[PDB]
Symmetry: C2
Subunit: 301 residues, 2 copies
């Protein structure tokens, strides 16, 4: 029995029309909104300087004309500025396809859609959850920097991620559009400390609710664990602390199963499934959010 | 260690611009290409007739004006015809955003991208593999029929799927654009026989190659199973028969591990992983194709 859950991204058309190529001296991608093009600042870096760039000096060394911005058109750069790990290039033409948009920061456990681009050309789209250590388990190769991640509310696109780098363990991280890197990461090509990943408890709860909604409830018992007790346990067992939301409450109402019943189940399941399966898995799944389950299974948006 | 594999869909913009709403008497989605709108023929069915429709009589009962086609514009229908399980509506305006396209049929184990739409509005995109029983493990609700699936080669979109129905086990099926349903399914709301699903052997091989490409090769031994011997075994063990491709051969060259080594490994792993993991899983994975692995990990397209 199939759960009806898939990794679901937003339609990407609105964002495709915002992607450009930026070249200064490698070539990466930029995001063109109104009269601004955003791109990673390491576009300025010579290849032999990627491990210890002096970005302040590099910025000083460029003129507006140093930055070549092309859409697959040529956009003339008339201003340049650095904000954190991003460049803000002012161009002479306002993107006529600029969507309604905001900038936001995504929180661990929350999902967003990524448009992977190479040489300014959209090539694929996928969805990821921001991990508790501020990496994403993405799919990015050389030339993908400047690819963007976003959520969407109504017609408004909320840009939350600009791709910067791959870590030694194969995961990925990037910047918010305030120019801060997610986590403690730096946009320099050196090995860096990585925080531990953790299971996202709220998303595990969501997935167990998805199981119940599909007739799979063998793991539900009358036993309950309080949120306070679970969160103490979580800190010793590589789980995030659980913070309930209205979305989780809607699943509890629809199924008649209390959150505290599933927090108890998680504690037991973490010790082992004992050969049993849940929605075809023998391990906890934390890559689907409460919102995913509400929307995809219940049609509640 | 993250494999760098995600469920990757094509960018959806080209197809978003082709989606319309079709209403005749429920409302579902259509695909507008040139002067033609394609949609499921059960748009003609009254709700009390979905279990045993007489589609030939329904078609006879409609005029061009019976079909209301709207883009979120109104497209005037000037001709109507039925081909298999699809309607072909001729409209008076050619879609100015028609991409270069073909129609194709997808084969079991092959991946395609789906644009899920409701009321003519694109709402999400995801990727699925066609299962050996001609279902897909999708995410579709009431109102999604007429949503389309496609592959893409260069700039050309190859449309391969138009959504029709959900089966009792939660999976999905639909039509090719020749109007044939995939598999033995009929577009009638009655319980129907479902063929067994099977593991897609070529995709399991691809995933084991992805593991090797990520430094995970504990399951590789000198032992080999021939393709002929494996395929005899597959028929008794709910696997597809294996048919190698150039894409698989590229993975064998890059890793230095022969296909026959991985066919032996599959036979052993199918008896159990013995507590060991491969790319974070304790079961065989068949949802990634050889092409996925070549493109996402090796950048070979
Ligand atoms: Mg379902
Ligand atoms: Mg990798």
């Amino acid at each position: 029995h199939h759960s009806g859950l898939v990794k679901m991204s937003h339609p990407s058309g609105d964002v495709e029309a915002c992607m450009v190529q930026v070249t200064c001296g490698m070539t990466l991608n930029g995001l063109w909104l109104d009269n601004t093009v955003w791109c990673p600042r390491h576009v300025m870096c010579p290849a032999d300087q990627l491990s210890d760039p002096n970005y302040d000096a590099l910025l000083i060394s460029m003129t507006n004309h140093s930055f070549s911005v092309q859409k697959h058109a040529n956009l003339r750069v008339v201003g340049h500025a650095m904000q954190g790990t991003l460049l803000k290039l002012t161009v002479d033409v306002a993107n006529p396809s600029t969507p309604a948009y905001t900038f936001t920061t995504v929180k661990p456990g929350a999902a967003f859609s990524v448009l992977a681009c190479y040489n300014g050309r959209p090539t694929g789209t996928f969805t990821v959850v921001m991990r508790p250590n501020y990496t994403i388990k993405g799919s990015f190769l050389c030339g993908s920097c400047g690819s963007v991640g976003y959520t969407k509310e109504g017609s408004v696109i909320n840009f939350c991620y600009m791709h910067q780098m791959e870590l030694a363990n194969g995961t990925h991280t990037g910047s918010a559009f305030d120019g801060t890197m997610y986590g403690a990461f730096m946009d320099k090509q050196v090995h860096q400390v990585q925080l531990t990943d953790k299971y996202c408890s709220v998303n595990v709860v969501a997935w167990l609710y998805a199981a119940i909604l599909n007739g799979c409830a063998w793991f539900v018992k009358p036993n309950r664990t309080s949120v306070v007790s679970f969160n103490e346990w979580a800190l010793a067992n590589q789980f995030t602390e659980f913070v309930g939301t209205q979305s989780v409450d809607m699943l509890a109402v629809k199924t008649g199963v209390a959150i505290e019943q599933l927090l108890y189940a998680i504690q037991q399941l973490y010790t082992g499934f004992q050969g049993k399966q849940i929605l075809g898995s023998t391990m906890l799944e934390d890559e689907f959010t409460p919102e995913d389950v509400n929307m995809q299974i219940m049609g509640v948006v």
